[PDB]
Structure 1
Amino acid sequence: MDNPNPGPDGEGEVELEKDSNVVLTTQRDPSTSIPAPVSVKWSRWTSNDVVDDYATITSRWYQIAEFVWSKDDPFDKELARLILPRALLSSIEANSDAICDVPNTIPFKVHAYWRGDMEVRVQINSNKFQVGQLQATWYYSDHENLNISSKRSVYGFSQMDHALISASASNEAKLVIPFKHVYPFLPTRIVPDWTTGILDMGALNIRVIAPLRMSATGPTTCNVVVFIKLNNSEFTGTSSGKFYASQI
């Protein structure tokens, strides 16, 4: 019972999440929160072209947002309103190169219609003396609402299920986000019946529940990393890559 023996290896036991060729480690246990059950594949009802997932490349993790989180950020402060099938591409364009240069998103350049489930692991690297707590919350189809600006606060996102990232224990947040949308496929480019708001499942947004509090000599910053897997994906509509417009 609670028998410490630290050493050159340290005390704790490392857990993993191995994927295709990207292995990321966590010392801490995830606070998993799953808003919806796993979806049926939906490739039978609306696709005659060759549907082929790419589990060797699409199910890899990819860092899409790191950010400094200081203690001087206020109580209900936005940190990242990441739109997950958009921020995966627009972060690649934030690296100032095309979508073809990344192995995780080359089927978005070739194929036209995406479906699939998305994993999110928001790691944090807080010191153990820092006290603060974030929440990672997924909201389906943010831009389709207009009163969401009056909802976008911790009092509203703590009612739906969500993960909690405590800076005390350096907690890590797994977030299984299945595909639920009005239409059973998200389009990845300019598309005959809608062009505005492309490839938009919703919004992972990470508000602050209580900010960093520390002594006068304390470590002020706290870097936060976001990872995304695209695990049970599929693609249809093989098309030319010259139709793929740049994301907004």
Structure 2
Amino acid sequence: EVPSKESIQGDATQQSSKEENTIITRDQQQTVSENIPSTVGDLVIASSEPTQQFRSLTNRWMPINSIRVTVNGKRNDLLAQYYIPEDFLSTHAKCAPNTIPFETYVYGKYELEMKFVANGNKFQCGKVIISVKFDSYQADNINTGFQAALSRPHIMLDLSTNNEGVLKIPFRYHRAFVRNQTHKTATAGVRPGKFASIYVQVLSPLQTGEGGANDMFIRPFYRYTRAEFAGMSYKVPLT
């Protein structure tokens, strides 16, 4: 919150977040989205049998693929986008222990937390925005601008300061549960594994000095704050 004078290990006034068997530190301040509620009450009706949590597996931090930001990138350009949970099961971090319960259970409710860590130098500058769109299936190509991102739950990343960002994502879906996996025997009438979309977009282009670096990198990390699974079945490979 307040910096100190320089010592052997610089300004040693870092903060950190410990979740299960994973720790992530931060050198500067962090921005955090509002803690907002999910749909509750339908759980007990939708599933006759009780739902299960596996906090040790699911509630740990897991890094996903690296994002490169360049000076060529213009405002409104998608740096990356994620259909969740699908892309965290069968695209990013496929060997993560977070994905183990999705092999056996067919349904679930999912509240996520996504931390973003940027590393640009002090002679660079730029703005990136990350936002969430709830129940985005067949509505990804509309309300998908920087302006829509600023309206929806979001976090803002300055590329010079390297402030961290934490997006809290509730479960807001038009059904009681989301389907975890497609299967050859299962119906194709319902799109599974997608209750929301995450967009990483350029708000202001990356700029650099004379003979400076023409790019810098951002790393997302995800965890489930509340992952309740329902409908046990035989284990299958993910997608």
- TM-score w.r.t. the length of structure 2 is 0.89
* Aligned equivalent of 2:112: 118
Structure 1 counterpart of 2:136, one-letter code: D
Please list, as runs of the form range in 1=range in 2, the aligned pairs for 1:34-45 lying within 5 A after superposition: 34=34, 36-40=36-40, 42-45=42-45
Residue ranges of structure 2 left out of the alignment (5+ in a row): none
2:73 alignment partner in structure 1: 73
Distance change >3 Å, CA 195–CA 22, structure 1 → 2:
farther
**Structure-2 residue corresponding to 1:170:** 162
In the alignment, the residues of structure 1 paired with residue 3 and residue 89 of structure 2 have an alpha-carbon distance, to the nearest angstrom, of 47
The within-5 A match list for 1:88-237 is 88-92=88-92, 101-145=95-139, 148-190=140-182, 195-237=189-231
Match of 1:23 in 2: 23
Structure 2 CA distance, aligned partners of 1:135 and 1:143? Answer: 21
In 2 relative to 1, CA 129–29 (structure 1 residues): closer, same or farther, beyond 3 Å?
Answer: same
**1:75 to partner: Cα distance:** 2.3
Q: Kindly state the Cα deviation for residue 83 of structure 1 after the two structures are TM-superposed.
A: 1.4
Partner deviation per Cα, 1:15-62 (whole Å, 9 max, x = no partner): 111111011111222211137325537431222334210011110111
Instruction: Give 1:180's aligned amino acid.
Output: R
1:58 aligned residue = 58
Q: Is the 8 A contact 2:38 2:172 kept in 1?
A: no
Distance 1:166 1:3, change over 3 A: closer
Paired with 1:227 and 1:165, the residues of 2 have a C-alpha distance of: 15
1:187 aligned partner, one-letter code: R
Query: Unaligned stretches of 5+ in structure 1?
Result: none
Secondary structure of 2:33's counterpart equals coil
The structure with the greater share of residues assigned to strand is 2
CA RMSD of aligned residues (A): 2.2
Q: Is contact 1:64–1:87 with CA below 8 Å preserved after alignment? A: no
Residue 240 of structure 1: SS of its match in structure 2?
Answer: coil
Q: AA paired with 1:238?
A: M
| 2:208 counterpart letter in structure 1 | M
Whether contact under 8 Å (2:135, 2:174) holds in the other structure is no
Instruction: Output the CA distance in 2 between the equivalents of 1:26 and 1:113.
Output: 35
CA deviation profile, 1:170-211 (whole Å, cap 9, x unmatched): 121101001110112111123756555321011110110101
Residue 154 of structure 1: how far off its partner (Å): 1.0
Question: CA 1:212–1:117 in 2, change beyond 3 Å: closer, same or farther?
Answer: same
Letter in 1 for 2:46: T
- 3-state DSSP class of the match of 1:233? strand
Return the TM-score normalized by structure 1: 0.86
Secondary structure of 1:84's counterpart equals: strand
Deviations 1:128-172 (CA, angstroms, capped at 9, x unpaired): 221100001111122232xx4243221222222321011121121
What is residue 6 of structure 2 aligned with on the other side? 6
Match of 1:157, SS state, is helix
Match for 2:91: what amino acid? S
- Rounded to whole Å, the distance in 2 between the matches of 1:144 and 1:183 is 15
Instruction: Rate the CA distance shift 1:3–1:54 in 2: closer, same or farther, 3 A.
Output: closer
Distance (whole Å) between structure 2 residues aligned to residue 182 and residue 194 of structure 1: 18
Report if aligned partners of 1:64, 1:91 keep a CA contact under 8 Å in 2: no
Task: Map Cα deviations across residues 65-117 of structure 1 (whole Å, 9 max, x no partner).
Answer: 3121111112221111111211211334xx6xxx5x43111100011112121
